């Protein structure tokens, strides 16, 4: 599990949480805090990387990790 | 793999087992024991955390980890 | 990734390979060897455990890890 | 996450990226570079192994890890 940042085409920065082979968009700072709590408890990765929307690394992550909504 | 606890709306506490990107409700103490045996054998996480039913961390785990029944 | 053994109802012992959240029955010693090669290369778990067909730990693994055929 | 090489029946060598329980064919050196960047950031495995198309280890990986396209 880890969090990454996504710089959108419209300019905003989104925080996304990878868990269980899935991707979750974090809509509020309270969701961000709880995701970081999960990372701390379950040995997740504390790396934070910001990806431009067109970055190939981001694209491969979005292809392999289905989005789920909370 | 790890176990967590869930405090239900009706007040009970459920034990859940995360494995293979899935969630398993543990119906008996014998299932709990065997799950902890799996954790010990395969390098799982021994963290035990109790989540209120409405906690956002729990909610993200339930969204990303499909339930399977045993 | 890891291998486990399953003692079947008819008495035989099957070797199974867990990878990618899936279970693979290993039909020959050549498949067993190649699976152990994968374990050695990709940091898998070298634990070998034998499960009776009715063991609850095995049952939870079979519920959470879909079988795929090779 | 890790990269492996596949020696095809027609003789070419393909680079594949394993992430999230999925397999991604890497079509360009820029995709290879970004995949290795992901490996470095998220604690992936730096092992590089070349598999002949008929190798049983490769076959089990292809059975257990669905291909996704980028």
Author numbering:
A (entry chain A), B (entry chain A), C (entry chain A), D (entry chain A): 168 to 237
Copy out sentences from the published article reporting this entry, exactly as the authors wrote them.
Endolysins are hydrolytic enzymes that specifically recognize the host cell-wall and cleave the peptidoglycan to digest the bacterial cell-wall for release of phage progeny during the lytic cycle, which is why they hold promise for the treatment of multidrug-resistant bacterial infections as an alternative to antibiotics. LysIME-EF1, an endolysin isolated from E. faecalis phage possesses a highly efficient lytic activity to multidrug resistance E. faecalis. PSI-BLAST search predicted that LysIME-EF1 consists of an N-terminal catalytic CHAP (cysteine, histidine-dependent amidohydrolases/peptidases) domain and a C-terminal CBD (cell-wall binding domain).
Ultimately, the dataset diffracted in the space group I422 was proved to be LysIME-EF1 CBD and the structure was solved by molecular replacement method at 1.75 Å resolution using the CBD from WT LysIME-EF1 as a search model. There was one molecule in an asymmetric unit. The CBD comprises a four-stranded β-sheet capped on each side by one α-helix. The LysIME-EF1 CBD was cloned into pET 21a(+) with an N-terminal His tag and the purified LysIME-EF1 CBD was subjected to size-exclusion chromatography and the elution profile is 17.7 ml in a Superdex 200 column (GE Healthcare) with an estimated ~32 kDa, supporting that LysIME-EF1 CBD forms a stable tetramer in solution. Detailed analysis shows that the tetramerization is mainly mediated by extensive hydrogen bonds and hydrophobic interactions. In addition, a sizeable hydrophobic interface is formed by the neighboring protomers, where the residues M227, M228, A230, A231, L232 of α2 helix from one protomer pack against hydrophobic patches 183WFVIGG188 and 191IYLP194 of the other protomer. Differing from that of LysIME-EF1 CBD, the elution profile of the LysIME-EF1 CBD F184R&Y218A is 18.7 ml, confirming that the residues F184 and Y218 are essential for maintaining the oligomeric tetramerization of LysIME-EF1.
